[PDB]
Design a protein around this ligand. Structure first.
Ligand SMILES: Cc1cc2c(cc1C)N1[C@H](O)C[C@@H](c3ccc(-c4ccccc4)cc3)[C@]13C(=O)NC(=O)N=C3N2C[C@H](O)[C@H](O)[C@H](O)COP(=O)(O)OP(=O)(O)OC[C@H]1O[C@@H](n2cnc3c(N)ncnc32)[C@H](O)[C@@H]1O
Lengths: 664, 133
């Protein structure tokens, strides 16, 4: 309903967000009934936009389709609609414009980066009547949304998965832009180093143990507060290892107390046989004595007759004892067959196990684009509460179609490497060079700069971009603490399909812990005959030191083992990526490093305000703004998160240079 | 509140494997050796108990002699009286043994005997001298 519009806008349908309290402090401090009116007007406009996102939702259109009592207060509707349009919750992306843009434009913004965050802001700022120029080091838009295209072969070297349309701003874009979105069938067959499928027995057993060990770290994290060790923060991998050890410890304590039940019963039998052997020796002697006393021929006197009867009683007595004791000896020779037939588990994990478990860790290092040794144990998954709902998809016509679609109608300078950012109390100038002939220098003057430089670029020492004046310590320390990791893709282009076409993705189990990332996974995703092979973890940063043929070699090897040494043709075309190599990226995407938190992701997003030119002049405007995947706490390292942060800063900048008339 | 079921995770266990770098590898060799230590000790007592089984060969079957089903009578042949006093001298108050020696007197006729012929057989003096041993 209307409540679905609020879910799909990432908004609680029955509560005002902290954003809305900032813009509407009258209402949220006011009576419960006004809050509900507002919340309905908010959700209802969202539904209108969401129901048709290929055309602008003007304020007139909106008020038209509310009814009383909700369409009574026109300024409350105009305030809500303005708010929405401003922070990119409606009329964002690629919509036909009803009210064509004003002829004269207010203020001037330079935007470093034509990445998806860059385009998303540029596209909104121009939407707001501003002057927006985009500076681009590459010869193409999109940034880390790269798409290979030759002939009919198509394959993203960058993002390729839309992580599911339940509340995903990308869901809106895909209606706006032609996107061939195909669901990803989640079934993944594993195949050992030899080439043989892992049996359904194993493949379930390890995976549950994997999942079990993760939760174990999480319990170590929050319940046992195991978050520092030798005065350093604990990492995920570091604690996974402590958890595997404590399970290997348990298997041993479990054999020790079991075999120790056997010695505790073996020596019951030792003591029992020792009675039984010394009792047979007493019996052996009385039988002799009773024999001799019975040898005396009658008629006997009575002491000699008592001696026969007596020794007889006494032998029947020691014959009960010995019979009772091989009764008891029966119970203990059966308990020793019991225990020696119910041994506890022999190992914690076998080298065939720990090697398939290593493939589940390669997956987790692929997910986070970093060795598990570097992720924060406490925080590596703080962004899990904001997951979308629905199937994960791929883009079958290539996902560059989205940046290119956004870049329409925008002022983009390609081949333009920003090299110095200079921001002062009265404006900013950005200094770029031409990437081809680096002598040729450019100067751009502007009211504000929006920096969507990758975190890896920002991390670069010595700097690729100089800030004048330098970024404050609180910003540079967030830049050092944050994590920017790495993963790479090998694209394999054949003339014919030779894999299971009903299987989107199938694994490869690696021989080592060290090489668990090396070519550990393959995707059939496309119409065409393209398999796409991933390199994760510690292996990611190392395969970049190795030529394409050597890499495509190892891939052909790996596939022969699994599909047969003669079904694997030569690849017609091959592409290896090297994202840590790439100087306009210097990595793949961010990760919550040990010693970092999601709080750093928020430091990354605070604008910079230059000091006053004239000492004692009033506190100026902020001039330098930050967007990009590393700036959005609740959706980091994604595309939709980039998008969202560009939408965010475009609202922030406009509220600054255009004023926000909707907060009264 | 509590772990996944099967993970073993005490506050105590955790610190013991953290105390230093190879404090993991350490405590897992005190256990691999505790396990060999018991494993060879289990192998030992197996052969000690296998030798003591061979001595018990034959059981006690040569040595066992038949049961005498005999109907329990009432009157006290002067023979049975005399068996009694000697059984009292050798068995004290164990009225079960004495009824097995005499063979056809119930354990209560045995107890009766103790008071009837208590006078005439100095049962008291006899018991004193039984207790000397
Ligand atoms: C590198 C790479 C990135 C992504 C993917 C794949 C690769 C190889 N794909 C993969 O399946 C993995 C996946 C994903 C999904 C969830 C997670 C996750 C979930 C939970 C927890 C943790 C993680 C992880 C992975 C996914 C995907 O499917 N969909 C997806 O959602 N985002 C994916 N991602 C991320 C996405 O790819 C990127 O996060 C956005 O693309 C961000 O872009 P943005 O920050 O806007 O910025 P940019 O970097 O794109 O643009 C910069 C511009 O600046 C230019 N520039 C530089 N320096 C200068 C200079 N000096 N002067 C002038 N210009 C300069 C540069 O040349 C470019 O022009």
């Amino acid at each position: 309903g209307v409540e679905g519009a609020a879910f799909q806008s990432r908004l609680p349908h029955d509560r005002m967000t902290s954003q809305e309290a900032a813009c509407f402090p009258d209402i949220i401090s006011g009576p419960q009934q006004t809050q509900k009116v507002f919340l309905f007007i908010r959700n209802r406009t969202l539904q209108l936009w969401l129901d048709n996102p290929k055309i602008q939702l003007t304020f007139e259109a909106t008020l038209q389709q509310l009814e009383a009592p909700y369409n009574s207060d026109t300024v409350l509707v105009h305030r809500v609609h303005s708010y929405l349009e401003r922070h990119g919750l409606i009329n964002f992306g690629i919509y036909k414009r009803i009210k064509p843009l004003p002829t004269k434009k207010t203020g001037k913004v330079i935007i470093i980066g034509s990445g998806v965050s860059g385009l998303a802001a540029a596209r909104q700022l121009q939407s707001f009547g501003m002057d927006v120029t985009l500076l681009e080091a590459r010869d193409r838009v999109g940034g880390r949304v790269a798409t290979f295209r030759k002939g009919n072969y198509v394959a993203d070297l960058g993002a390729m998965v839309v992580t599911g349309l339940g509340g995903n701003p990308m869901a809106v874009v895909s209606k706006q832009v032609n996107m061939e979105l195909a669901k990803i069938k989640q079934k993944c067959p594993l195949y050992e180093a030899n080439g043989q499928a892992v049996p359904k027995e194993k493949d379930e057993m390890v995976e549950q143990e994997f999942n079990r060990l993760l939760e174990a770290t999480s319990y170590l994290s929050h319940q046992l507060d195991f978050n520092v060790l030798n005065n350093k923060p604990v990492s995920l991998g570091q604690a996974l290892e402590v958890v595997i050890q404590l399970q290997e410890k348990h298997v041993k304590d479990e054999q020790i107390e079991h075999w120790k039940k056997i010695v505790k019963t073996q020596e019951e039998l030792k003591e029992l046989l020792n009675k039984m052997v010394n009792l047979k020796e007493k019996i052996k002697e009385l039988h002799q004595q009773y024999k001799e006393a019975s040898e005396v021929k009658p008629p006997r006197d009575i002491t000699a007759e008592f001696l026969v009867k007596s020794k007889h009683r006494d032998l029947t007595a020691l014959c009960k004892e010995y019979d009772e004791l091989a009764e008891t000896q029966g119970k203990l020779e059966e308990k020793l067959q019991e225990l020696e037939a119910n041994p506890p588990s022999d190992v914690y994990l076998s080298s065939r196990d720990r090697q398939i478990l290593d493939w589940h860790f390669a997956n987790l290092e692929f997910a986070n684009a970093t060795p598990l040794s570097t992720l924060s144990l406490k925080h590596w998954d703080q962004d899990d509460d904001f997951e979308f709902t629905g199937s994960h998809l791929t883009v079958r016509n290539g996902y560059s179609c989205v940046p290119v679609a956004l870049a329409e109608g925008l002022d983009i300078k390609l081949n333009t490497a920003v090299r110095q950012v200079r921001y002062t109390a009265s404006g900013c100038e950005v200094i770029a060079v031409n990437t081809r002939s680096t002598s040729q220098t450019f100067i751009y003057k502007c009211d504000a700069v929006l920096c969507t430089l990758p975190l890896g670029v920002l991390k670069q020492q010595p700097p690729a971009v100089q800030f004048v004046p330098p970024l404050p310590e609180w910003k540079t320390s967030a830049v050092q603490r944050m994590g920017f990791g790495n993963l790479n893709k090998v694209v394999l282009c054949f003339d014919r399909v030779f894999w299971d076409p009903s299987v989107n993705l199938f694994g490869h189990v690696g021989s080592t812990t060290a090489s668990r990332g090396e070519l550990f996974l393959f995707w059939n995703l496309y119409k065409a005959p393209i398999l796409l092979a991933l390199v994760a973890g510690e292996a990611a940063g190392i395969m970049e030191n190795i030529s394409d043929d050597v890499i495509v070699g190892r891939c052909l090897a790996i596939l022969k083992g699994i599909f047969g040494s003669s079904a694997v043709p030569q690849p017609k075309e091959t592409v290896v990526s090297r994202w840590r190599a790439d100087p306009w990226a210097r990595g793949s995407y961010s990760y919550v490093a040990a010693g970092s938190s999601g709080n750093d992701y928020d430091l990354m997003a605070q604008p910079i305000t230059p000091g006053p030119s004239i000492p004692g002049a009033p506190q100026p405007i902020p001039r330098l703004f930050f967007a990009g995947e590393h700036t959005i706490r609740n959706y980091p390292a994604t595309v939709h998160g980039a998008l969202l942060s560009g939408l965010r800063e475009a609202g922030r900048i406009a509220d600054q240079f255009l004023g926000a008339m909707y907060t009264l | 509140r509590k772990p996944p079921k099967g993970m073993f995770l005490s506050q105590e266990d955790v610190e013991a494997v953290s105390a230093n770098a190879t404090a993991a590898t350490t405590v897992l060799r005190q256990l691999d050796m505790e396990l060999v230590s018991v494993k060879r000790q289990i192998q030992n007592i197996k052969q000690t108990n296998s030798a003591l089984k061979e001595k018990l060969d034959g059981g006690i079957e040569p040595y066992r002699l038949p049961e005498v089903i005999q109907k329990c009578n009432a009157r006290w042949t002067t023979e049975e009286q005399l068996l009694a006093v000697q059984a009292i001298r050798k068995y004290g108050r164990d009225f079960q043994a004495i009824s097995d020696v005499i063979g056809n007197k119930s354990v209560v006729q045995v107890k009766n005997f103790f008071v009837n012929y208590r006078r005439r057989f100095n049962i008291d003096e006899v018991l004193q001298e039984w207790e000397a041993e």
